[PDB]
Design a protein around this ligand. Sequence first.
Ligand SMILES: CCn1cc(NC(=O)C2CCC2)cn1
Ligand SMILES: [Cl-]
Length: 115
Amino acid sequence: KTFKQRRTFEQRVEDVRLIREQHPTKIPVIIERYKGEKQLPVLDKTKFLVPDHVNMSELIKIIRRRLQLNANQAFFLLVNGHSMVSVSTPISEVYESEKDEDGFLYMVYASQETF
Ligand SMILES: CCn1cc(NC(=O)C2CCC2)cn1
Ligand SMILES: [Cl-]
């Protein structure tokens, strides 16, 4: 069901290695709906190539646009299982401290802060 369930550790590591070779300026991001979520739609895909200069605040605006949300739908984004301490950090920094051992950056979204 979830990305980590669908692909082996060996498979995830090799995909990250091919993104490094072919999209060297991009952060490989896995974005998933909270298994509890009722209100927000599911995304059209799971694996995202995010330009490494964008900060978390802009990435939240990107995903809100992808979901086609309006001004007063709530949207919370967990990185590596937890709240972002700051939305102003460049995703290249966030990656180095929050990356998985397979080399993806894992994010989860919901309409409640309580996931
Ligand atoms: C080759 C696959 N690919 C993916 C993108 N863009 C994204 O994933 C979006 C996240 C913000 C831009 C471009 N090419
Ligand atoms: Cl690139």
